[PDB]
Amino acid sequence: PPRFNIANVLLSPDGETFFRGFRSKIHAKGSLVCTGEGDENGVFVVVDGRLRVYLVGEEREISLFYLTSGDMFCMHSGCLVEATERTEVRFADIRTFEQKLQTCPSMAWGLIAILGRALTSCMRTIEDLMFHDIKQRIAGFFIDHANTTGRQTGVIVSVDFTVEEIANLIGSSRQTTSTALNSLIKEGYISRQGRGHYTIPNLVRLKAAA
Amino acid sequence: PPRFNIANVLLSPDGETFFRGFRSKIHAKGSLVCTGEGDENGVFVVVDGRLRVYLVGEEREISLFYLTSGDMFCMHSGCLVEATERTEVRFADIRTFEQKLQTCPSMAWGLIAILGRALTSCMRTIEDLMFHDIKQRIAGFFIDHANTTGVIVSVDFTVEEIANLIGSSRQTTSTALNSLIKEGYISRQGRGHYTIPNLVRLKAAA
Ligand code: HEM
Ligand code: HEM
């Protein structure tokens, strides 16, 4: 789904009043906006602030994504939501929201976009599990095969190998490596500056990714 | 999101023409509709048949959910899509789909529904992965803490001890453990006392 820019609808004659009537609510920092076994429900839109959406397990907490000014979310996703700041949100029950959406279909894209954000986040988390090891292995490879340049502008860790050269070395398939590596590149652990040429920003973090 | 009934839109004067213009394509059984790296892009709606949406990973596949008549989906999810039987889809490019959605907003709920279904499927898949991992943890735990005697090999630890040592919660491990029990790989003969029938089976899980 495309990303959604809510000002487009709020500034439009049609969407301008969308939230008229929505109650307002404030969440103190560190407070749980909602969690499983939740007896609450409804829909809200962040006015300002920041909320974290996640799941937990394996001694580790999986941060899915964040909610900031303009983002919409519900109280029944089975996800945990906490304020990492004092955040204000407009609130309303599902029905009211559905009514408003049908009266102003263009606002629907906000929902579409956040469902997409939530989805890819999860895919990423699933991807991190189906490849936990190959990624540490490749993080090992990059550590063991890295070489630096003179600090006199200056200082850059490099690893010049092509995905196939890498795949051959570590063993795993070429397509599996590509995903693992592409995964690591997302996390910013490894930068790609052309085919067969990479760079390692901050080697201490990559070391931590192994 | 709510469930979506596409007939509702298609039978309405406004939505009746929604797909008027989409091309048609028959996907043979076993056929791969979407490759993890297909590169081309567009949106389709299943006419009839059934498609599988899965992800590959470290020599092994995991099924997320299936598409059947009325379901819409895209060619850029990143997920692989194979047909589990002769399936017919109506496809078009993103541009065309978005244009149609613009003039027929009500059909957007179909997009919203598939996204919710995929979201839901993924959250279930994540829960499965982690539950599967904690089990192996408890599996390997029983391996490195076996009291082979008389032969009646065993393990003398309460649920809270295994949990703490495992680096998990008394509740978490407890449900993963009892799972390992129902399946006959460990037997709980009293608090803090378990026996390991067949050690190779347990050492297999790990
Ligand atoms: C029909 C079901 C659809 C599904 C389930 C879906 C799924 C996805 C997923 C999973 C992503 C993340 C890509 C990644 O893994 O990196 C995404 C991105 C994207 N999708 Fe869709 N999509 C759909 C429909 C659409 C439509 C209708 C449009 C456009 C009107 C669209 C436009 C995009 C764009 C622009 C991106 C990349 C930019 C971004 O959002 O960050 N998608 N989509
Ligand atoms: C604001 C974004 C929203 C998100 C993130 C979202 C997410 C979800 C998720 C994950 C579920 C499955 C829960 C489970 O079974 O564990 C669900 C179910 C449901 N949602 Fe939403 N939802 C949103 C908004 C809404 C809205 C606006 C409505 C009303 C139009 C709604 C109506 C429902 C209903 C009725 C169910 C049950 C449908 C089913 O089981 O397929 N949701 N939602």
Side-chain angles (χ1 to χ4, degrees), chain A residues 101 108-109 111-112 115, chain B residues 1-2 72 107-117:
Chain A
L101 287 180
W109 289 86
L111 168 56
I112 287 174
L115 276 169
Chain B
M72 299 175 309
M107 184 64 88
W109 290 88
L111 171 65
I112 283 157
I114 200 64
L115 287 161
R117 176 120 75 71

PDB file of all heavy atoms in Angstrom, chain A residues 101 108-109 111-112 115, chain B residues 1-2 72 107-117:
ATOM      1  N   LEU A 101     -15.827   6.979   7.780  1.00  0.00           N
ATOM      2  CA  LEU A 101     -15.072   6.489   6.623  1.00  0.00           C
ATOM      3  C   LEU A 101     -15.936   6.362   5.386  1.00  0.00           C
ATOM      4  O   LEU A 101     -15.518   6.715   4.282  1.00  0.00           O
ATOM      5  CB  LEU A 101     -14.429   5.137   6.913  1.00  0.00           C
ATOM      6  CG  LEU A 101     -13.239   5.176   7.863  1.00  0.00           C
ATOM      7  CD1 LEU A 101     -12.716   3.783   8.039  1.00  0.00           C
ATOM      8  CD2 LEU A 101     -12.158   6.080   7.305  1.00  0.00           C
ATOM      9  N   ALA A 108      -9.958   6.542   4.167  1.00  0.00           N
ATOM     10  CA  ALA A 108      -9.720   5.093   4.266  1.00  0.00           C
ATOM     11  C   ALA A 108      -8.267   4.727   4.021  1.00  0.00           C
ATOM     12  O   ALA A 108      -7.760   3.733   4.559  1.00  0.00           O
ATOM     13  CB  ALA A 108     -10.603   4.331   3.273  1.00  0.00           C
ATOM     14  N   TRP A 109      -7.591   5.523   3.204  1.00  0.00           N
ATOM     15  CA  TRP A 109      -6.203   5.225   2.902  1.00  0.00           C
ATOM     16  C   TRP A 109      -5.285   5.293   4.113  1.00  0.00           C
ATOM     17  O   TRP A 109      -4.209   4.695   4.114  1.00  0.00           O
ATOM     18  CB  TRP A 109      -5.721   6.116   1.767  1.00  0.00           C
ATOM     19  CG  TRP A 109      -6.362   5.698   0.498  1.00  0.00           C
ATOM     20  CD1 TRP A 109      -7.580   6.088   0.023  1.00  0.00           C
ATOM     21  CD2 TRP A 109      -5.880   4.700  -0.404  1.00  0.00           C
ATOM     22  NE1 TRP A 109      -7.889   5.388  -1.116  1.00  0.00           N
ATOM     23  CE2 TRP A 109      -6.862   4.529  -1.401  1.00  0.00           C
ATOM     24  CE3 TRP A 109      -4.712   3.921  -0.459  1.00  0.00           C
ATOM     25  CZ2 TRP A 109      -6.713   3.618  -2.449  1.00  0.00           C
ATOM     26  CZ3 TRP A 109      -4.564   3.009  -1.499  1.00  0.00           C
ATOM     27  CH2 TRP A 109      -5.564   2.867  -2.480  1.00  0.00           C
ATOM     28  N   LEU A 111      -6.062   4.037   6.977  1.00  0.00           N
ATOM     29  CA  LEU A 111      -6.218   2.679   7.499  1.00  0.00           C
ATOM     30  C   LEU A 111      -5.443   1.693   6.631  1.00  0.00           C
ATOM     31  O   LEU A 111      -4.741   0.809   7.138  1.00  0.00           O
ATOM     32  CB  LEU A 111      -7.705   2.314   7.522  1.00  0.00           C
ATOM     33  CG  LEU A 111      -8.116   0.867   7.771  1.00  0.00           C
ATOM     34  CD1 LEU A 111      -7.524   0.360   9.094  1.00  0.00           C
ATOM     35  CD2 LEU A 111      -9.642   0.800   7.786  1.00  0.00           C
ATOM     36  N   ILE A 112      -5.580   1.846   5.316  1.00  0.00           N
ATOM     37  CA  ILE A 112      -4.874   0.987   4.390  1.00  0.00           C
ATOM     38  C   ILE A 112      -3.366   1.106   4.671  1.00  0.00           C
ATOM     39  O   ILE A 112      -2.679   0.105   4.895  1.00  0.00           O
ATOM     40  CB  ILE A 112      -5.182   1.402   2.931  1.00  0.00           C
ATOM     41  CG1 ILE A 112      -6.609   0.981   2.565  1.00  0.00           C
ATOM     42  CG2 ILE A 112      -4.182   0.789   1.981  1.00  0.00           C
ATOM     43  CD1 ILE A 112      -7.063   1.463   1.189  1.00  0.00           C
ATOM     44  N   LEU A 115      -2.139  -0.500   7.922  1.00  0.00           N
ATOM     45  CA  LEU A 115      -2.250  -1.950   7.921  1.00  0.00           C
ATOM     46  C   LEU A 115      -1.024  -2.475   7.181  1.00  0.00           C
ATOM     47  O   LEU A 115      -0.463  -3.509   7.544  1.00  0.00           O
ATOM     48  CB  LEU A 115      -3.552  -2.394   7.238  1.00  0.00           C
ATOM     49  CG  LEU A 115      -4.764  -2.366   8.181  1.00  0.00           C
ATOM     50  CD1 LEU A 115      -6.069  -2.546   7.401  1.00  0.00           C
ATOM     51  CD2 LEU A 115      -4.597  -3.459   9.236  1.00  0.00           C
TER      52      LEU A 115
ATOM     53  N   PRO B   1      -9.833  -5.037  10.845  1.00  0.00           N
ATOM     54  CA  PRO B   1     -10.786  -4.615   9.814  1.00  0.00           C
ATOM     55  C   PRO B   1     -11.949  -5.594   9.764  1.00  0.00           C
ATOM     56  O   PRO B   1     -11.828  -6.738  10.212  1.00  0.00           O
ATOM     57  CB  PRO B   1      -9.965  -4.677   8.524  1.00  0.00           C
ATOM     58  CG  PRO B   1      -8.530  -4.660   8.990  1.00  0.00           C
ATOM     59  CD  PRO B   1      -8.577  -5.485  10.230  1.00  0.00           C
ATOM     60  N   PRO B   2     -13.093  -5.167   9.209  1.00  0.00           N
ATOM     61  CA  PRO B   2     -14.236  -6.084   9.136  1.00  0.00           C
ATOM     62  C   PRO B   2     -14.017  -7.068   7.994  1.00  0.00           C
ATOM     63  O   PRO B   2     -13.074  -6.938   7.212  1.00  0.00           O
ATOM     64  CB  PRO B   2     -15.423  -5.164   8.846  1.00  0.00           C
ATOM     65  CG  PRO B   2     -14.899  -3.748   9.066  1.00  0.00           C
ATOM     66  CD  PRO B   2     -13.448  -3.836   8.688  1.00  0.00           C
ATOM     67  N   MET B  72      -8.417 -10.192  -3.348  1.00  0.00           N
ATOM     68  CA  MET B  72      -7.542  -9.343  -4.153  1.00  0.00           C
ATOM     69  C   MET B  72      -6.169  -9.423  -3.522  1.00  0.00           C
ATOM     70  O   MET B  72      -6.043  -9.667  -2.316  1.00  0.00           O
ATOM     71  CB  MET B  72      -8.030  -7.890  -4.152  1.00  0.00           C
ATOM     72  CG  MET B  72      -9.425  -7.737  -4.739  1.00  0.00           C
ATOM     73  SD  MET B  72     -10.141  -6.072  -4.634  1.00  0.00           S
ATOM     74  CE  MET B  72      -9.910  -5.712  -2.902  1.00  0.00           C
ATOM     75  N   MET B 107     -14.975  -0.473  -2.876  1.00  0.00           N
ATOM     76  CA  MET B 107     -14.176  -1.655  -3.146  1.00  0.00           C
ATOM     77  C   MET B 107     -12.889  -1.640  -2.320  1.00  0.00           C
ATOM     78  O   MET B 107     -12.225  -2.665  -2.184  1.00  0.00           O
ATOM     79  CB  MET B 107     -13.823  -1.734  -4.638  1.00  0.00           C
ATOM     80  CG  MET B 107     -13.069  -3.002  -5.033  1.00  0.00           C
ATOM     81  SD  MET B 107     -14.099  -4.476  -4.781  1.00  0.00           S
ATOM     82  CE  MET B 107     -14.949  -4.582  -6.374  1.00  0.00           C
ATOM     83  N   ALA B 108     -12.528  -0.488  -1.770  1.00  0.00           N
ATOM     84  CA  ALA B 108     -11.298  -0.394  -0.983  1.00  0.00           C
ATOM     85  C   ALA B 108     -11.359  -1.317   0.237  1.00  0.00           C
ATOM     86  O   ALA B 108     -10.324  -1.799   0.726  1.00  0.00           O
ATOM     87  CB  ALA B 108     -11.041   1.082  -0.535  1.00  0.00           C
ATOM     88  N   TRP B 109     -12.562  -1.575   0.732  1.00  0.00           N
ATOM     89  CA  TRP B 109     -12.679  -2.441   1.893  1.00  0.00           C
ATOM     90  C   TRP B 109     -12.175  -3.856   1.607  1.00  0.00           C
ATOM     91  O   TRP B 109     -11.802  -4.589   2.517  1.00  0.00           O
ATOM     92  CB  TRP B 109     -14.108  -2.429   2.425  1.00  0.00           C
ATOM     93  CG  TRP B 109     -14.426  -1.104   3.047  1.00  0.00           C
ATOM     94  CD1 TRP B 109     -14.929   0.002   2.418  1.00  0.00           C
ATOM     95  CD2 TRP B 109     -14.155  -0.705   4.403  1.00  0.00           C
ATOM     96  NE1 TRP B 109     -14.983   1.065   3.296  1.00  0.00           N
ATOM     97  CE2 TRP B 109     -14.514   0.660   4.518  1.00  0.00           C
ATOM     98  CE3 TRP B 109     -13.639  -1.367   5.529  1.00  0.00           C
ATOM     99  CZ2 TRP B 109     -14.377   1.376   5.716  1.00  0.00           C
ATOM    100  CZ3 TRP B 109     -13.501  -0.651   6.722  1.00  0.00           C
ATOM    101  CH2 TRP B 109     -13.869   0.708   6.801  1.00  0.00           C
ATOM    102  N   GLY B 110     -12.127  -4.224   0.336  1.00  0.00           N
ATOM    103  CA  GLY B 110     -11.600  -5.525  -0.016  1.00  0.00           C
ATOM    104  C   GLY B 110     -10.094  -5.493   0.183  1.00  0.00           C
ATOM    105  O   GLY B 110      -9.493  -6.474   0.627  1.00  0.00           O
ATOM    106  N   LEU B 111      -9.466  -4.366  -0.136  1.00  0.00           N
ATOM    107  CA  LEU B 111      -8.015  -4.245   0.034  1.00  0.00           C
ATOM    108  C   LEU B 111      -7.708  -4.223   1.525  1.00  0.00           C
ATOM    109  O   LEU B 111      -6.765  -4.883   1.997  1.00  0.00           O
ATOM    110  CB  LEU B 111      -7.508  -2.960  -0.627  1.00  0.00           C
ATOM    111  CG  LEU B 111      -6.054  -2.547  -0.392  1.00  0.00           C
ATOM    112  CD1 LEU B 111      -5.094  -3.556  -1.003  1.00  0.00           C
ATOM    113  CD2 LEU B 111      -5.836  -1.168  -1.000  1.00  0.00           C
ATOM    114  N   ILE B 112      -8.520  -3.472   2.269  1.00  0.00           N
ATOM    115  CA  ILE B 112      -8.366  -3.368   3.718  1.00  0.00           C
ATOM    116  C   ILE B 112      -8.523  -4.757   4.359  1.00  0.00           C
ATOM    117  O   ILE B 112      -7.810  -5.106   5.301  1.00  0.00           O
ATOM    118  CB  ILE B 112      -9.441  -2.427   4.309  1.00  0.00           C
ATOM    119  CG1 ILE B 112      -9.066  -0.966   4.048  1.00  0.00           C
ATOM    120  CG2 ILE B 112      -9.639  -2.708   5.783  1.00  0.00           C
ATOM    121  CD1 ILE B 112     -10.265  -0.017   4.072  1.00  0.00           C
ATOM    122  N   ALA B 113      -9.447  -5.562   3.847  1.00  0.00           N
ATOM    123  CA  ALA B 113      -9.659  -6.884   4.433  1.00  0.00           C
ATOM    124  C   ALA B 113      -8.494  -7.835   4.171  1.00  0.00           C
ATOM    125  O   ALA B 113      -8.054  -8.554   5.081  1.00  0.00           O
ATOM    126  CB  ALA B 113     -10.972  -7.499   3.919  1.00  0.00           C
ATOM    127  N   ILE B 114      -7.980  -7.853   2.945  1.00  0.00           N
ATOM    128  CA  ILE B 114      -6.882  -8.760   2.688  1.00  0.00           C
ATOM    129  C   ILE B 114      -5.668  -8.367   3.518  1.00  0.00           C
ATOM    130  O   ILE B 114      -4.955  -9.238   4.009  1.00  0.00           O
ATOM    131  CB  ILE B 114      -6.510  -8.831   1.188  1.00  0.00           C
ATOM    132  CG1 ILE B 114      -5.740 -10.122   0.930  1.00  0.00           C
ATOM    133  CG2 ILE B 114      -5.657  -7.641   0.771  1.00  0.00           C
ATOM    134  CD1 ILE B 114      -6.559 -11.376   1.181  1.00  0.00           C
ATOM    135  N   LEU B 115      -5.434  -7.071   3.699  1.00  0.00           N
ATOM    136  CA  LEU B 115      -4.294  -6.636   4.503  1.00  0.00           C
ATOM    137  C   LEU B 115      -4.459  -7.092   5.947  1.00  0.00           C
ATOM    138  O   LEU B 115      -3.490  -7.490   6.584  1.00  0.00           O
ATOM    139  CB  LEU B 115      -4.143  -5.107   4.462  1.00  0.00           C
ATOM    140  CG  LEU B 115      -3.623  -4.492   3.154  1.00  0.00           C
ATOM    141  CD1 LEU B 115      -3.950  -2.993   3.076  1.00  0.00           C
ATOM    142  CD2 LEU B 115      -2.118  -4.749   3.066  1.00  0.00           C
ATOM    143  N   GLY B 116      -5.681  -7.032   6.470  1.00  0.00           N
ATOM    144  CA  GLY B 116      -5.910  -7.452   7.843  1.00  0.00           C
ATOM    145  C   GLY B 116      -5.705  -8.948   8.014  1.00  0.00           C
ATOM    146  O   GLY B 116      -5.193  -9.416   9.031  1.00  0.00           O
ATOM    147  N   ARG B 117      -6.120  -9.703   7.004  1.00  0.00           N
ATOM    148  CA  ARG B 117      -5.985 -11.149   6.999  1.00  0.00           C
ATOM    149  C   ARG B 117      -4.511 -11.526   6.952  1.00  0.00           C
ATOM    150  O   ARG B 117      -4.087 -12.461   7.620  1.00  0.00           O
ATOM    151  CB  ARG B 117      -6.687 -11.724   5.771  1.00  0.00           C
ATOM    152  CG  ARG B 117      -6.540 -13.228   5.609  1.00  0.00           C
ATOM    153  CD  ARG B 117      -7.902 -13.889   5.633  1.00  0.00           C
ATOM    154  NE  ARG B 117      -8.664 -13.707   4.400  1.00  0.00           N
ATOM    155  CZ  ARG B 117      -8.360 -14.299   3.253  1.00  0.00           C
ATOM    156  NH1 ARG B 117      -7.304 -15.094   3.189  1.00  0.00           N
ATOM    157  NH2 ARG B 117      -9.141 -14.145   2.185  1.00  0.00           N
TER     158      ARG B 117
END
